[PDB]
Amino acid sequence: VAMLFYVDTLPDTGAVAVVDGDEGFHAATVRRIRPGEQLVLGDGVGRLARCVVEQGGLRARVLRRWSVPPVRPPVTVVQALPKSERSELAIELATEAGADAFLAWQAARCVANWDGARVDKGLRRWRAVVRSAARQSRRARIPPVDGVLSTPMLVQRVREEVAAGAAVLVLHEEATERIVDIAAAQAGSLMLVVGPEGGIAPDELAALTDAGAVAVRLGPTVLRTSTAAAVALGAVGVLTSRWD
Amino acid sequence: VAMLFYVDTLPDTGAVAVVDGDEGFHAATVRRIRPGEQLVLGDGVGRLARCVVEQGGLRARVLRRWSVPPVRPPVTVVQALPKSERSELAIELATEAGADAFLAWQAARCVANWDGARVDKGLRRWRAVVRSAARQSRRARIPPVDGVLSTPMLVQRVREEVAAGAAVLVLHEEATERIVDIAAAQAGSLMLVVGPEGGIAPDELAALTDAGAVAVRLGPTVLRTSTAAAVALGAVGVLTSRWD
Q1: Interface-testing mutation among A227, A239, A240, A242, with chain B (most B C-beta atoms within 10 A)
Q2: CB-CB contact of B179 with B228 (8 Å)
């Protein structure tokens, strides 16, 4: 199976392409791919190109180009992400599971205070992690990563999303409502809210539920920060036209 | 929220319990839990006990005991597991996702030859990994780990399972059948087959499909060895009475 490589701008059908020094070292020295073998190039924004290897630097000539339309209903994963290796994993698994975008949220039981620069460094790191998972998952569109939202910013976003016809689901353990019995197929968009390891506080939960979000449970399974979004995405895929 | 600790044998309602030296160091030195706080003890085989901390060693007196019946339809995760950190992760995420048992399989594109002792060491390691994930997932039943099956052993097991009314699903990328349109709710048992990183060979796939397994796809999402079972478990939870 052909390996995907992200490029800033996909070249035209006739044109050749050179893979960046670091990404091109992964193909010639790490993987060691012979010239004549055919790889796939992507702009990470919907466009894909089937390329044949001509020649440190990797030279591949486009055979054919095409674009992949965005998956509807798109799913946004809102996750309480601290500065940890566990956050990176959540972001990675959700990307493999097919998450369409990410919103980093600082919940009540998080509070790992960052400056303006640190939030920017932190988001750039997550973007690198998502780019890598997306590449290995042969994804045409790399899901965006944006943050870091406060609860009042998130609550305002839930109000805005619900009004625009989106289904906002808060993955909560002690929820009286099940994911199964939800108006999923009718919704034009979806937003999965995953709280921190310490869980969502009652004050935050009420604020989010009052905005239009619904607290939903994922069966008897205890919601784990690493698996919550990936398991919910598998449920959402079946409930919605996402896999149908 | 109370922490779960696995014990070989749960003591009676009146009786006190001492947590093992290594597991008891996790509560007094790692987590530092004050006496008077109440924890949960489990035998890892369906039985749970609510205990109050009396006193290196941790002394907890049972308040009340109870047993959790097995989840039906149970899901068995058959996974091509080599000796890697990626295998451990697959086993961990599936445990969080609610897998009921594991079968380690050596597929055509695996072949990391082990001796009788190594298979035994390897299975004991996976059991430790599953025990840890199960503990953090507050699981009453630790899913068993058994292997290492050959393709003819697996094919014979599929024939046996299908005959006993089980739905055997082979997670395959180029499958013409979708997980959505499957006789899931009627099945009394389920078996998810996850191949290696190199994928399932056509000869193995035919052997498994001829036995009674059905090649099923998980939407547009490229099946990744780490996420395949956890995403499928989320789909299976919705399709079956597992979450209903």
Answers
A1: A227
A2: no
Sheet of A189-194: strands edge to edge?
A: A145-149, A101-105, A75-79, A189-194, A166-171, A214-217, A177-178
Q: Which CATH number goes with the domain that contains B61?
A: 2.40.240.20
Does A219 reach chain B within 8 Å, measured CB to CB? yes
- Regarding whether A24 and A54 lie in a shared domain, the answer is yes
Which whole-number Å values give the CA distances from B214 to A156, A238, B173, B190, in the listed order? Answer: 45, 18, 12, 12
A/B interface, count of CB pairs below 8 Å? 114
B77 and B22 in a common domain: no
In the sheet that A58-67 helps form, which strands lie side by side, from edge to edge? Answer: A4-6, A38-42, A47-53, A58-67, A16-19
**Mutation to test the B interface, candidates A85, A225, A238, most B Cβ within 10 Å:** A238
Q: Which residue has the tokens 């349109």?
A: B181
Domain residues for the domain of B155 are 69-244
Amino acid at B219: G
| Token code pair at residue A36 | 């004549």
- Closest Cβ opposite residue B235 in set A138, A199, A237: A237
Question: Final residue of a domain: which of A25, A43, A68?
Answer: A68
Does A73 lie at the interface with B, CB-CB under 8 angstroms?
Answer: no
Strands B16-19 and B58-67: antiparallel
If one counts the domains in chain B, the total is: 2
Assign 3-class secondary structure to A28-79.
HHHCCCCECEEEEEECCECEEEEEEECCCCEEEEEEEEEECCCCCCCEEEEE
Q: Which is nearest to A62 in space by CA: A40, A45, A89?
A: A40
Joined tokens for residue A231: 């398991």
Q: Give kind and range of the element (H or E) at residue A157.
A: helix A151-163
Way the structure was solved: X-ray
Residues linked to residue B48 through DSSP beta bridges, in sequence order: B42, B66
- Report how far residue A57's alpha carbon sits from residue B219's, in angstroms, rounded to the nearest whole number: 35
CA distance A27 to A3: 9
> Of B186, B191, B236, nearest to B212 (Cα)?
B191
For position A186, which CATH number holds? Answer: 3.40.1280.10
Q: Residues 6 or more apart from B205 whose CB is under 8 A from it?
A: B170, B172, B215
Give yes or no: residues B41 and B136 share one domain: no
Cis bond before residue A73 (omega within 30° of 0): yes
Nearest to B244 among A180, A227, A243 (CB): A180
| Ramachandran bin of A42, using left for φ above 0, alpha for ψ from -120 to 50, beta for the remaining angles | beta
Q: Quote the crossing angle between the two packed helices B151-163 and B202-211, to the nearest 10°.
A: 30
